[PDB]
């Protein structure tokens, strides 16, 4: 009602230039996790083949690791850790969970 | 008075919505081939648009009161 | 509808639309309309945009600091 009177900017005055970088890297990590999931559903229902699925996923995971081990790595991983701890770790078996965890593979909600 | 209108207003807004959803899936069916970045770019921009306006009214309607 | 409240409605609208557009791109991949690499590039972009929209929503609807 009145609680939302004026339109707010993406980055208000409490945002430093470093936060912006952090947020952008997070948006990039977000895109990969989302894409990773769609590529898999794609493969699962035969839209692409073994190789395509494999080459693609590999490219993505590498760029992913790079986002977690580059500029502002400190802040970024703090956000990711809590993000992952909040993830809906369901429909994924503890069996598969360990495989992924050792492989550095992020959680991708498969519905 | 300033209450009977709502009924009809909802009705009209509710119908434009169904038309957008229709315009949505229609565009998708029509786009049976992309031969250039432009073509795809156009599709994405138009689909995304129709889709946004669709949800906007969609949420404006179920929140009418 | 205030200015801020209007914004909120559009941001939300954009979030859902962005998902719809990604999904649509998925069907185009499945139907053979577009190749994998195209889906990945476009999808990534739309998804990146989605995060930005959502984070924005969070900032607005947060206990303002």
Curated annotation (Swiss-Prot), chain A:
Domain VPS28 N-terminal, by residue range, is: 1-111
Q: List the disulfide bonds.
A: none
Protein localization: Cytoplasm; Endosome; Late endosome membrane
**Additional observations:** Present with 1420 molecules/cell in log phase SD medium.
Q: Briefly, what is this protein's role?
A: Component of the ESCRT-I complex, a regulator of vesicular trafficking process. Required for normal endocytic and biosynthetic traffic to the yeast vacuole.
How does this chain assemble?
Component of the ESCRT-I complex (endosomal sorting complex required for transport I) which consists of STP22, VPS28, SRN2 and MVB12 in a 1:1:1:1 stoichiometry. Self-associates. Interacts with VPS27; the interaction mediates the association with the ESCRT-0 complex. Interacts with VPS20; the interaction mediates the association with the ESCRT-III complex.
State the family it belongs to.
Belongs to the VPS28 family.
Q: What is this protein called?
A: Vacuolar protein sorting-associated protein 28
**Species the sequence originates in:** Saccharomyces cerevisiae (strain ATCC 204508 / S288c)
From Swiss-Prot, chain B:
Tell me what happens on changing residue 44 to R: Abolishes ESCRT-I complex assembly; class E phenotype (malformed late MVB)
Q: What does this protein do?
A: Component of the ESCRT-I complex, a regulator of vesicular trafficking process. Required for normal endocytic and biosynthetic traffic to the yeast vacuole.
Disulfide bonds listed in the record: none
The protein's superkingdom reads: Eukaryota
Placed within the complete protein, the shown segment runs 142 to 206 of 213
Q: Provide the family line.
A: Belongs to the VPS37 family.
Q: Which residues form the VPS37 C-terminal domain?
A: 1-65
Assigned GO CC terms = endosome; ESCRT I complex; late endosome membrane; nucleus
Subunit arrangement? Component of the ESCRT-I complex (endosomal sorting complex required for transport I) which consists of STP22, VPS28, SRN2 and MVB12 in a 1:1:1:1 stoichiometry. Interacts with STP22 and MVB12.
Keyword Lipid metabolism appears in the UniProt entry: no
GO biological process assignments: ATP export; endosome transport via multivesicular body sorting pathway; protein targeting to membrane; protein targeting to vacuole; ubiquitin-dependent protein catabolic process via the multivesicular body sorting pathway
Species per Swiss-Prot/TrEMBL record: Saccharomyces cerevisiae (strain ATCC 204508 / S288c) (Baker's yeast)
What name has this protein been given in UniProt? Answer: Protein SRN2
Swapping residue 40 to R leads to an effect described as:
Abolishes ESCRT-I complex assembly; class E phenotype (malformed late MVB)
Annotated localization? Cytoplasm; Endosome; Late endosome membrane
From Swiss-Prot, chain C:
Q: Which residues form the SB domain?
A: 2-65
Outcome of mutating residue 25 to D: Abolishes ESCRT-I complex assembly; class E phenotype (malformed late MVBs)
Give the location in the cell: Cytoplasm; Endosome; Late endosome membrane
Kindly list the cysteine pairs connected by disulfide bridges.
none
Q: How does it assemble?
A: Component of the ESCRT-I complex (endosomal sorting complex required for transport I) which consists of STP22, VPS28, SRN2 and MVB12 in a 1:1:1:1 stoichiometry. Interacts with HSE1 and VPS27. Interacts with MVB12 and SRN2.
Of which family is this protein a member? Belongs to the ubiquitin-conjugating enzyme family. UEV subfamily.
Q: What does this protein do?
A: Component of the ESCRT-I complex, a regulator of vesicular trafficking process. Binds to ubiquitinated cargo proteins and is required for the sorting of endocytic ubiquitinated cargos into multivesicular bodies (MVBs). Mediates the association to the ESCRT-0 complex. Required for vacuolar targeting of temperature-sensitive plasma membrane proteins STE2 and CAN1.
Q: What is known of its domains?
A: The UEV domain is required for the interaction of the complex with ubiquitin.
Miscellaneous field? Present with 1360 molecules/cell in log phase SD medium.
Protein's name according to its UniProt entry: Suppressor protein STP22 of temperature-sensitive alpha-factor receptor and arginine permease
Please report the organism this UniProt entry assigns to the protein.
Saccharomyces cerevisiae (strain ATCC 204508 / S288c)
Starting at the broadest rank, the lineage of the source organism is:
Eukaryota, Fungi, Dikarya, Ascomycota, Saccharomycotina
Shown residues within the full chain = 322 to 385 of 385
């Amino acid at each position: 009602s009145q609680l939302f009177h004026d339109e707010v900017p993406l980055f208000d005055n409490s945002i430093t230039s470093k936060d912006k970088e952090v947020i952008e890297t997070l948006s990039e990590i977000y895109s990969i996790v989302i894409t990773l999931d769609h590529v898999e559903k794609a493969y699962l229902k035969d839209s692409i083949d073994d190789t395509q699925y494999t080459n693609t996923v590999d490219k993505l995971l590498k760029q992913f690791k790079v986002y977690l081990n580059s500029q502002n790595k400190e802040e970024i991983n703090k956000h990711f850790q809590s993000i992952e701890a909040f993830a809906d770790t369901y429909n994924i078996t503890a069996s598969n969970a360990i495989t992924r965890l050792e492989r550095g593979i992020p959680i991708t909600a498969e519905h | 008075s300033k209450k009977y209108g709502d009924i009809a207003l909802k009705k009209k807004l509710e119908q434009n919505t169904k038309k957008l959803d229709e315009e949505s899936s229609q565009l998708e069916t029509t786009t049976r081939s992309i031969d250039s970045a432009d073509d795809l770019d156009q599709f994405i921009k138009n689909y995304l648009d129709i889709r946004t306006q669709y949800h906007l009214r969609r949420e404006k309607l179920a929140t009418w009161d | 509808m205030t200015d801020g409240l209007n914004q909120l409605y559009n941001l939300v609208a954009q979030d859902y639309a962005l998902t719809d557009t990604i999904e649509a791109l998925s069907r185009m991949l499945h139907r053979g309309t577009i190749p994998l690499d195209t889906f990945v590039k476009q999808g990534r972009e739309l998804a990146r945009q989605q995060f930005l929209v959502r984070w924005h929503i969070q900032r607005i609807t947060s206990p303002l600091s």
